[PDB]
Structure 1
Amino acid sequence: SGRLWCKAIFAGYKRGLRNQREHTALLKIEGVYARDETEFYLGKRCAYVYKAKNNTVTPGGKPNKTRVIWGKVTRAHGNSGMVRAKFRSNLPAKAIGHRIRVMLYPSRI
């Protein structure tokens, strides 16, 4: 009856300086501040939840108005705690700064 996910703020695609590759999107995780901690968050199923106008189906429920885009966490990035993520379909530019979820459940403990 509480939150069973962890907060994660989307930050930017994997870009150079005068290109960009949108198939690998960065994340920051509140609580982790080094590359030595981020060995807990490898292979964890991350997600993204938005909402729209029309009504869509929902597995185990009446058709709501909300939608999702699932994904996966592949590898680390930087020496600070940033981490990459590979979504199935590439993300919009509307969400720079908004909230995505990461789960925990493909655990390794």
Structure 2
Amino acid sequence: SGRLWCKAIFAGYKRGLRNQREHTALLKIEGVYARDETEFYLGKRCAYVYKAKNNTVTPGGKPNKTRVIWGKVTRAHGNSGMVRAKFRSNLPAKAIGHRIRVMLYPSRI
């Protein structure tokens, strides 16, 4: 009867001014605003959810549009709320400024 994931926004690759690295992303988890705050989120599963023209089969459903890229939160980044990531499938840059779900499951409570 509701949601079971936390909202966040892909906000560029890991990089310094003039050479970009594509094997690490950079998420802005919602309402989390220092380092202190970001222990929880470490290791915890994450998902980019999307929708191609043709039918992909699923597990636990019918063969339909919807697909995912899967990944993993690794460590904190900076001073201010941010977080790094490592999906198995390297992300599109379409998704810059679009939604991703961090889950709650591999919990440590």
Q: How far did 1:64 drift?
A: 1.2
Q: How far did 1:17 drift?
A: 0.6
Query: Which has a greater percent of strand?
Result: 2
Can you list the C-alpha shifts for 1:17-74, whole angstroms capped at 9, x where unaligned? 1100010000001110010000110010011101010011010111110110010000
Percent identical among aligned pairs is 100
Q: Distance in 1 between matches of 2:66 and 2:104?
A: 22
Q: How far did 1:101 drift?
A: 0.5
Report the RMSD for the aligned CA atoms in angstroms.
Answer: 0.6
1:1-109 → structure 2 map (5 Å cutoff): 1-109=1-109
SS in 1 for 2:64: coil
TM-score after normalising by structure 2: 0.98
TM-score after normalising by structure 1: 0.98
Q: Distance in 1 between matches of 2:93 and 2:31?
A: 25
Contiguous gaps of at least 5 residues in structure 2: none
Q: How far did 1:78 drift?
A: 0.4
Q: Distance in 1 between matches of 2:16 and 2:31?
A: 27
